[model samples]
Target chain A: EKSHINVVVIGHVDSGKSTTTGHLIYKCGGIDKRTIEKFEKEAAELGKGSFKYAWVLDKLKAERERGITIDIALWKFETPKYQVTVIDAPGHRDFIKNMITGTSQADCAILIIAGGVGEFEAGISKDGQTREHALLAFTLGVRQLIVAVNKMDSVKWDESRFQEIVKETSNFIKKVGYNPKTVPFVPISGWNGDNMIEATTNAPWYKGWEKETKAGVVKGKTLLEAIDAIEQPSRPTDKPLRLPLQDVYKIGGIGTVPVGRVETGVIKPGMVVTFAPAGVTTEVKSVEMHHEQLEQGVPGDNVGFNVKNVSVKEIRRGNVCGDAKNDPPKGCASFNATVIVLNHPGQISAGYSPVLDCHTAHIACRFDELLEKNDRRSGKKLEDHPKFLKSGDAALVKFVPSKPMCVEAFSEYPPLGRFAVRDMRQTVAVGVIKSVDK
Target chain B: PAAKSIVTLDVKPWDDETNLEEMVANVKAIEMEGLTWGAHQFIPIGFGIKKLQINCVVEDDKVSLDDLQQSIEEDEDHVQSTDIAAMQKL
Candidate 1:
């Protein structure tokens, strides 16, 4: 059997993340009394005199207590052709920091846009209506995308609006650096179960059908598909094993277990890897992906490994693992990245040092040089010495991190290469790694 | 560009369920804050009302921000402020 596809459902908050996920899981037969119980208890607490907005993904202890999705939640669905891992899309821009922590695991990102006339009248802009969170997925370097123009039931299932939404989405994707050649637009209704899991009869003009055909997904017969159909970042056996230090803990009697996702290449047992600047090599005693003892863990695998030669004092967070043999250059000074200036309340201006999240590692980034800028909403290029940028604009800029950070080109292993600049936990700009000219 | 913020909200636990009120309220607060702060002119990012929530926006006009923020805040407060017994009885 083919493995699951790690996918994420992203869009503006009202583009129907919970509704789509809820309906999908319901169709997939994943929902049970457990989900119901949580909703029930929550409704009882929320004063259920007509509480119609019961969503399964909002079951966070904090969100349950207050009611908005503060973080992304993972949910699963199994189609005949593929297993879908639906990540609850983040609504607010500030919480995107929390999103990258989970979305890094996703292979395909579904941009859910509200297309129905009645429901999304508010979503319409002079340009078009898209979820606020769609930009977050782009900055994370999730280039493979699908736009699901949802909520067709509200418009009496119109096809014209579907096409209109498609046209708008096609234009918007360019701002985020998504190649239209690879991106497909699927006009779906998450509530009525139309054009999603199966085909619907609502819009007669809807010709391109992916849910029924499953054409966009990679061929099932490839060696890559055979390994993991989800298409997660492949673990390179030849490259150095780099791990982002998330948390370090003590095993029963073993030693300090460094826990985090294995971001790039591959990490193997007994490989002597060096942390940057600290220049210390640790012999990987053992590498484990959650429960299993992995002989070698590749990219996207959440693994914890034992250190043999180096001490915990030698390494901390933001350090990657690579063979000292073919080690990536480490530095605390300058680099170039193609980014989208995200206009938020907080400053991302010069000298504002913040965490530049690249892959699983978050390195300290300071604004150094401002390069070319492109407006996202209007697709306009700004003139020289522009002091400010807003949402949807992409630019090429320069910066240096407080700690040593290693990033490749977006063309070459875009996973570790791209980074997002966040000011006070909000993603302000996304930088595609072109070259790590340190 | 969309204006963004980190909203630390304090309300009754009723804002905690998956309801439209909290989401609407979040959208409102962000819009209001944006208008007051001259935050980036933003489009209203609609999130479903299902719980007590937080959100941010980059709005262009103070009037537009005020309108959206109030509509949703009222909705959230109406539902979230009411006690379960009182709501059911009504």
Candidate 2:
């Protein structure tokens, strides 16, 4: 049996994220040449011929017209050993809200960076989303990262240029608290397929990196190899059942169906579950994933199941579903979280209410008090009861939701524990819940 | 005309037979300063028959949280507790 893994491709807008992913999918034969040619002619007739490959995943008319992936897209393929689900996350800062939707479901990530002239600078600089995406990925439980320096062909495969970008990114993610040794940096051209599937002579000075594969002792690890090389992260099946609702749908002939990946525990048919924050309890009428009825669903399976007593209006996003028998989900009026402010209009202080995007729920949360300031990298105490925090500042603060919400402690159910702070459609901070005043 | 604000009140039914429709009609019957109910939701609050939380816009200066609570429970003994869960501006 082949194991499954979810890998999210993320980077700045126009940084070749989707192109790289689209190219990989093309190489994997996920899309046939005939369909791509059809979309190519359609795109060429519309004067978007350059985006032919990307059209395979960027299927929406608006997305095709704009040539930017407004939302996340998922496609599936297989390697020699594992079945991979590719989640292509958006790079536009405007869609950071939607980006997290895909990222939260990722088991690992492939961070893309363009190696062309001036492109790499803009990606990692202030206006770029490269840093924001990487930091958010770590905060959202994607511990394993593969930094792919894409478009190396444009840089003429310059060793110093690729090495320089790698060093800077290494420093940045390290400052954000990721182990430098654990993150593997790979150089490739997603557009030309250089160093993607097989080794290329683009860089004669570079030596081959080796990894053990099902085929045994593969050399010059490609992007596909890098993905297959990732060890599966541990999941909490022994914990309480926690399935954060991603979306609710109304099927014809079927009742209201809730769709999301089970983050923890096991769910079986006929089990009475509690959907919390709303606190609605209903018996599971049926469970289906990919159109097949599932007798039981374990963690990491994205499913859509029907329940007995909840309507489409009642079950909104951000509601966590848990077993009604034991360890039922709880709602809290207030909670404490450690946050690192990435961007803000100005200083953030008590009484500042910003809309928080947690799981599928977007609720306004007020900062009640600044408990203490902490070192961003070390978690050591810096100050007690700070008055305010500005951009780049990290602090522990108490927050109260304007209404009741379902948020868990980060040490517990991680899916519902992490959050991103957004204002005016911009992500200002990202953090994890330390404690909830349930 | 005084200014208006939004307030969400959490109310529990008097008993098992009391449904949400009767409680909502009673809320409409209650007279308070410039009160106009908007969205209403029923949520679970630890076991015994779930509670109903309703949102209404009211005159900011004319009405208090206690005044709105009293108006709902004034003539109807079928209402157990009508507490203001949240209050905000329109």
Candidate 3:
């Protein structure tokens, strides 16, 4: 398979990312509200809209609480164009660290912005956090931008005002290093179903149906078949077998099984594979996701497969599964990733290293390597590797684990590779898989 | 000028430890901070009750009445089940 798209829905708190998912899956008639309502009470009780909507993916009870600051949820949809996996990202500033964890794997993103791109009135984000995230998404090489400029329902569906916000966002997109000329910006009310999955026929004034463009691009843009455009470097492809370890679950009766998704590659039984960070070597004892064991597992299947002779203990999430031949990932002393720091007692600078959490594995890591730090507003490079990064700055910096860590190139195998670094109450950094700084 | 009463919120952070003892210590630390001089009394919500909770307390008039309810409502997204379970309606 040559082409794959992972769409992450992100924005400010209560920016209707959840409502957008509800509009897509339920309102679009893919799933029912009964399935949705069952979780609404739980989501409301927990207080995070992303989870309430994401609870559809995060079946774990411990993950539903909103006040937790940590955001985790996944959703899958097979559109007529392509098989789309929507990762519901937390809009809160601290959760920005996790954005890289999810963004590393995303091909394109469905960015939700309320009040257009300029009027960010909600007191949710600090100055520059939203732009930082958008910039980070672009830095990670997510090119296909399907922006949902939502909340028209709240603004009385004023086309002029909507266009104003769109124009502002379009300009900002170029400033933040995104190609505004190619990125598709569509005005949609994620809550009211304006140009989401439903055709934008009611908004007769709008130019085209927004949702279909995304679906069409995915279906029409074939990897091998695209004679015109060369595939972007970041799109997930069938290269070497890569599986990012998500979690280890132990059934009461059965032994522990490690679960994760195959981002881009094939997993065949009996293939020799290497595990990250732990450096545990094992043969493929079994392979399957959601109970359909097979001779092979392809990209986009979140499965729980087992390895021979390795105990469930000592292995956790954020580890990688790669072909033994290429060795796509390796355990290292440290590396680099983009990050966000919140609740810091002092400003963060280069060498502001802290214990970094990479997926399910925790390797003592620090923020040492600095590539570039930028002020989201100006999109200006603050420092090549500033000693520290403060809240709301998007920087590509070096992450050197205090101890040995196992990670991959964010461009290569994003699963089992990214992490969020937190010190005290605030999350300080978001990183995608990068060289282990060997 | 009247003595200043500022509305402040705390986003308590914890290490990877999940033991019950650590959880209780976090709560007691919050209470002690609230009792410290110069900090007007307000209801506390985090330190195990909610990791990132928002609440309105009448002790401090710093936050206007209108914004108090809104702040609490907004924080509901970050509040957890333990917050709801521990608090009693006034």
Candidate 4:
């Protein structure tokens, strides 16, 4: 039984993330040749033929012409070890907010790095997002990361260059909380299919590791094989039911259908649910997954369910749903979250306000108090007690929302409690709630 | 009358063992001298030590931003650092 594993694919702008993921999906037979050929013809008509594979995932005209992923492109395929759902996210800084929204549901991630022309340097540079992406994933609760050193063909498949990148990135990745040994660095050309599906002789120094899984031992682990080896994460269905609404749509006679992942607990038909922040009550009329009706949906299942009495306009993405009688979602006006400032021009003091994206909620929050400053890495005690928090500073903070929110404690509810701070068109900080205060 | 100015100062306690009440009183006393008191915001400065942000309004001609910095700096007794966050003309 292959369970579902949500994997988010990310990387620097123009790092071949979409090409590599689209190519992998194509090789896996997710996209048939006819579809590829048709897309190829369509792109070629507009002088975008070179982006045919990427166009498979870049469904929008704006993305195809700009050569960027503006939104998430989702597709699913099967492996012997697991059922894989791939979310290809945009890499440009402009779309980072969406990238975080996309990666929030991922169990693991594939970080693509363009391997030639010192592109890696500019990518992991002081201001680059490769660092931000890696750190965000780690902080946002993505445990497993597979770094794909892509476009090695442009570097002539030089063995030393790949190894050098591996060493350098391994150190930096470790700084972000990933164990270097567990993270795999694969070299491949998304265009030429080198190391995408099969191990190539183009790089004789390439010796793949021993990947042992239920599918049997594979000496040279291909990218697909690595994905197949990941085990399904444990679901906390036994807890109180909570589903942070991702989307809401109307289904004609069936009334308004609320769609979101079951964050925890379970829901079945006729069960009364209370939506948070708004605290509205409604009964689950029916539950559906992939249009198949389900008696009950547990944690980790992306579901669309009809309700007894609710309009699509009444619900929004950040609202969480819970079993009314059992354990409903918790709402708060202000909460304390220990935040680490990833990037800020100056120190962040009291009255510092920025827009916060937590769960489906988007609201500006004021930094009411800079409670305490701690070491970013070791949780060590420090008392330099700077007037304000700057880049690379981690501290416990009190945040009062401009309005009501449904954020929970990180340890209690992993998804609803985590948040990203955005201002000036870039993600400034990412943090988890240590505790929620009234 | 000089133009009114609003100056925000973030002051940290020198150590954890110091009396918070004494510190607060010292801050209040220092703030009372020729300054119109504003909101006193408590800040957590780590290691059990606390910091206070005192926002006060002063006539720009009477006290420059430097005078506020100097006044807090002289209280080396309680503050680790004195930072004037902003001084805006009202």
Best by TM-score: 2
Model 3 residue B88 CA deviation (Å) reads 28
Worst 10 residues of 2 chain A by lDDT: A64-73
What TM-score goes with each of the models?
Answer: 0.65, 0.69, 0.60, 0.69
Instruction: List, residue by residue over A267-352, the lDDT tens digit for candidate 3.
Output: 77788887776777777777765436677877766566666667767666667777787655577765666554443456776656
Q: What share of the true interface contacts does candidate 3 keep?
A: 0.00
- The residue-level lDDT of candidate 4 at A308 comes to 64
Model 3 alpha-carbon miss at residue A166, Å: 1.9
Q: Select the stronger candidate by lDDT from 1 and 2.
A: 2
Q: Which regions of candidate 1 fall more than 4 Å away from where they truly are?
A: A29-33, A36-72, A100-105, A124-132, A168-183, A202-239, A250-253, A346-352, A359-363, A371-393, A406-408, B1-90
A195 in model 2: Cα distance from truth in Å?
1.0
What are the per-residue Cα lDDT tens digits for candidate 1 across A99-204?
5443344567777778765545555343332444556566665556766677777667676777777776777776556766566566666766676556677666
User: Which scores higher on TM-score, 1 or 3?
Assistant: 1
| Candidate 4 lDDT, B26-79, residue by residue in tens | 766764333665556565432233456666666544554444556666766665
Encode model 4's per-residue lDDT on A1-438: one tens digit a residue.
Answer: 867788877666668776687776766745335545556677766664565455554453222222222111235677767768776654334334444543336788888888876678777775676677677777767887787888888999898898898888878787777876777677888877777777777888888744334556544447776777565777677888888876565554556676677877998988999988888898888887754678998877767788867777787677889989986786786788778887766668889899998866788999888877887666675754456888988888888889777888888877777787887656778777888763
lDDT of 4: 0.68
| Docking quality band of candidate 1, CAPRI definitions | incorrect
**Residue A265 of model 3, lDDT score:** 82
Higher-ranked by TM-score: 1 or 2: 2
Name the candidate, 2 or 3, with the larger lDDT value.
Answer: 2
Off by over 4 Å in 4: A39-72, A102-104, A210-219, A245-261, A278-285, A288-293, A300-317, A384-386, B1-90
Individual DockQ of the candidates? 0.03, 0.02, 0.03, 0.01
Candidate ranking (TM-score, best to worst): 2, 4, 1, 3
